[PDB]
Design a protein around this ligand. Sequence first.
Ligand SMILES: Nc1ncnc2c1ncn2[C@@H]1O[C@H](CSCC[C@H](N)C(=O)O)[C@@H](O)[C@H]1O
Ligand SMILES: Nc1ncnc2c1ncn2[C@@H]1O[C@H](CSCC[C@H](N)C(=O)O)[C@@H](O)[C@H]1O
Ligand SMILES: [Zn+2]
Ligand SMILES: [Zn+2]
Ligand SMILES: [Zn+2]
Ligand SMILES: [Zn+2]
Ligand SMILES: [Zn+2]
Ligand SMILES: [Zn+2]
Lengths: 425, 425
Amino acid sequence: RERLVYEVRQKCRNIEDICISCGSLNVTLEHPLFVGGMCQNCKNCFLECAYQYDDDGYQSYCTICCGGREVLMCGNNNCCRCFCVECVDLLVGPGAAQAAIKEDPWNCYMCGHKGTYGLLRRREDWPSRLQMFFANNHDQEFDPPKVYPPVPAEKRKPIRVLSLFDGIATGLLVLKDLGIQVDRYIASEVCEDSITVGMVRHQGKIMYVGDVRSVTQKHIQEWGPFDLVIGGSPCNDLSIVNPARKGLYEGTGRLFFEFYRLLHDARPKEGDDRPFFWLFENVVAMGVSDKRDISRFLESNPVMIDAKEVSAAHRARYFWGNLPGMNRPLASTVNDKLELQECLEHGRIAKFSKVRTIQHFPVFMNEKEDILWCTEMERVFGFPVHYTDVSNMSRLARQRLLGRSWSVPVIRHLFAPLKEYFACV
Amino acid sequence: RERLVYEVRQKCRNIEDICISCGSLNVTLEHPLFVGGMCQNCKNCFLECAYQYDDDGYQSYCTICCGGREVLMCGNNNCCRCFCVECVDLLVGPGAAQAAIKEDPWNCYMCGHKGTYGLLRRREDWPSRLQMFFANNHDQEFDPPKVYPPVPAEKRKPIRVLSLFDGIATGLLVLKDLGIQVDRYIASEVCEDSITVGMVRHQGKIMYVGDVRSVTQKHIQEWGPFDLVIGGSPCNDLSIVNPARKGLYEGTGRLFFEFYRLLHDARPKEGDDRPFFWLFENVVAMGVSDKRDISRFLESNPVMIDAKEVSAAHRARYFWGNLPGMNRPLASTVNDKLELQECLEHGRIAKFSKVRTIQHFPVFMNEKEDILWCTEMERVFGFPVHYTDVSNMSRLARQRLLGRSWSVPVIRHLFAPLKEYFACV
Ligand SMILES: Nc1ncnc2c1ncn2[C@@H]1O[C@H](CSCC[C@H](N)C(=O)O)[C@@H](O)[C@H]1O
Ligand SMILES: Nc1ncnc2c1ncn2[C@@H]1O[C@H](CSCC[C@H](N)C(=O)O)[C@@H](O)[C@H]1O
Ligand SMILES: [Zn+2]
Ligand SMILES: [Zn+2]
Ligand SMILES: [Zn+2]
Ligand SMILES: [Zn+2]
Ligand SMILES: [Zn+2]
Ligand SMILES: [Zn+2]
């Protein structure tokens, strides 16, 4: 693309007529953040790569092209973006990257105070375009989810939940917080610590099953009709945060199908018009063909929901499902804490306003750099105070346990219209 | 196990009380071919490894322990077994392997003419035990397939077939050979050569679809009710014959679920008691957890069927399904050719009686070593004479095309009782 952008700056080619990521001429889209066109292969790359972060908490690849060999990290607080040397040679000029390295307090171009440069200019409604960009994923066209008519209030009954990959029983907790009567809560999980957390916090009510692969269709039938089936595949191997990324499709992908199977096992037959609901959860840093196969099998379009809208964590997650109002915008109640500082312990001050979890140690306390405490990690994700202090487990394990979990106010947002279909306390 | 077999030969321990594969004390089974016990981990290893062959046409690992670091290949004609140096040190004695290397015309212990040795003796009903060994896979317990009562002859109608991973239309060909009227034959396939083969040989009757992943439930509904859904996942990546074995679960495993999905899409509802039948096919050289997940999802027990019983090829394949009489023993009609020589062209003589396809070049013609000709490969698998000579394709591709296919008399054996449920020509 060096010669093509030579012709762009000579006013012989429009920058909007060229794909600013790789220099392709097959322009179909516009680049959502900056000025230029966008080809489809770069859209797939952008889907996979944009929200991939390294162990330093900064982006794994360049923000522009979603590739790049050596990148520029950003000095500005809470910003995690990177711009590779090659991109800066076109849009800011030749040698601007090598000169920009030497600028010790440097701000990236999404954070630049001027907001206007010569060849590169920032497009104004970029957050709106970022939200629209996932609606722009009409390549995987699917039929709209079947809307079930509301059951009258006197006729409502307690909800029954099959919860696969339950973890620390975030789903049941949220259902309690919403005041929905829970007839029963069947849960499959294999990690003993998470089992214990659920046992204690939910007071023996949870009927514990073993591995998901031991659950047969006969099991599904004899454990009574289910009203709500929920689950989230393992995300630790999909996430770029784990240093030992042996594979992505291995382990986690197989377990996905387990959800798939039991979903069909729990689904009412056609002609049985009783209300039935399901939710699957996954990370945004995933493969495109992976995401397609998931969308193909669950026969639906993903919704991306980021917890930043309602909580103090960057937690962007896909939610497939047929719960009513899964698309509607997220509202943050006053109880929710949109600033990191409100979630800290007294005596601590946060330089950060959000913690990126999908400047390693986020806290300045007594002029020293510390990790968030376990009870604060609970407060960040919306869990009740001292939620995971049940058994005698190490801090590393307990942090890990909290880290995998669903963001509580997001899950409250999703589960809230179920109150219109089931009984209240 | 060296010290344990020291105590075995001192008449202080029974060889039947020790696992002769790895020396484990957790004896649950008996070794099917030879004298000793067998632990469960070695059973899983034996399931994965026994029918794995290298590119030389001989076994990938030792026959005894299904491991081994350096193996002894067998001199006897058509025998492909290998025995590693370590195994021969216990059962035949120390240094017997190094001395046995020096014996230039050497026979392995499954082929030895005496049939009786000191520590190792061959158990007599080993083929019967080999057949029973797959019935011995009761670890994956499942309910018996639902038997549908026979429809009266006057009421019978033409069969409708959804055929995924169709290849060269072996299924429709076999249905024609059985004289079953075929209302329609919907087929998904992506390889153009195989499409062409089916087009020509089946005279435009086949309605060709694209990739299986583009077939929706709506497609399944609007293409009319299906009476028979069949398919076999890609086996080239699972097979050890391809040198570039990057993975086994990638590509082929994902495509398996496609079958799974469309099967549920094509299945009649409960309460609709109309006859419906399905068949899935796969190779025997596969992983145990892979085989378990397949058995879990199709909710059935595999049947292993080897084509040697009815054809001139070693073609051991798993068949899941609910077709009546899928367990019953295979009969070879006089038309079928149990000897390789009958399948050769005139002027050729086969040293081999069977061709192992899952001394590379199987034929001595004019005192020279040659590959089987394409028309003979067709004759080996039971295809009609000159079946794949349709378009202008290379020999390597055309052999490959034939190689993937289902064995015709095996498929005839499976499909034969469908004549009791549908209309005849
Ligand atoms: N085979 C298996 N069966 C059930 N759970 C499993 C499993 N393998 C891994 N898991 C669990 O699946 C979870 C995935 S992340 C769980 C998030 C959950 N929604 C929460 O709020 O905590 C992990 O806790 C892991 O322990
Ligand atoms: N995505 C896909 N959709 C349909 N077929 C595919 C496919 N990917 C690979 N295949 C085909 O699946 C076949 C698997 S082996 C086919 C055997 C078949 N029963 C026969 O008699 O020939 C291959 O021919 C391969 O071309
Ligand atoms: Zn591009
Ligand atoms: Zn870049
Ligand atoms: Zn910045
Ligand atoms: Zn053993
Ligand atoms: Zn061995
Ligand atoms: Zn032999």
